[PDB]
């Protein structure tokens, strides 16, 4: 079996973020034109997806981390990762 990745990018340099689920933990590797380095994201999960968008010069990232039947959204809006409001179908 394999580690599971998800990727997003923005701008023209570009910035790239790659999320890897391995052994129940999701971590983040980052590129901004000057080498790869480890990002701040650390959350539990066996499955990962990601999307991002810009508002002006501000990036917003949403990572969807799942274990079992539970998906948790994690939000980056420039000031630390916080849990998002995402909930599944009812
Ligand atoms: C993320 C993920 C984990 C954590 C898994 C498994 C899978 C998995 O999904 P993914 O990697 O996308 O899909 C697989 C792929 C691409 C291949 C080629 C697989 C398997 C899976 C399924 C089946 C599988 C799984 C195993 C183990 C130990 C083996 C040997 C194993 O047979 P293997 O001959 O490699 O075949 O258990 P493990 O605790 O790693 O659980 C089950
Ligand atoms: C405490 C602290 C935080 C929270 C920072 C930064 C710095 C910082 O001070 P310090 O570490 O003492 O001094 C630095 C040192 C010694 C080096 C070698 C630096 C940077 C800093 C500056 C620049 C820097 C900063 C970055 C990021 C993502 C990178 C890649 C990044 O380039 P990097 O190749 O590491 O170069 O943002 P980050 O959110 O970490 O903010 C900025
Ligand atoms: O520059 C690296 C960083 O601050 O970029 C925004 C997010 O990807 C963070 O998790 C990450 O640590
Ligand atoms: O500011 C965080 C938030 O409102 O951003 C938009 C969506 O990702 C929401 O689930 C999330 O709670």
Residue numbers in the entry: 1 to 90
Reported in the publication:
Here, we report protein recognition and assembly by a phosphate-containing macrocycle (pctx). The test protein we studied is lectin (RSL, ∼30 kDa), a 6-bladed β-propeller with C 3 and pseudo C 6 symmetry.
RSL–pctx cocrystals in space group H3 diffracted to atomic resolution and the electron density maps clearly reveal encapsulation of the N-terminus. ∼115 Å2 of Ser1, or ∼65% of the residue, is buried by the macrocycle. Ser1-Nα forms a salt bridge to one of the phosphates, while Ser1-Cα and Ser1-Cβ each make CH-π bonds with phenyl rings of the macrocycle. The fourth interaction is a hydrogen bond between the Ser1 hydroxyl (Oγ) and a phosphate of pctx. Considering solvation, eight water molecules form hydrogen bonds to the three phosphates (H2O···O–P-pctx = 2.6–3.1 Å). Each N-terminus of RSL binds a macrocycle, the three of which form the base of a tetrahedron. A fourth capping macrocycle completes the pctx tetrahedral cluster and is devoid of a guest. The Lys34 side chains from three RSL molecules each form a salt bridge with a phosphate of the pctx cluster.
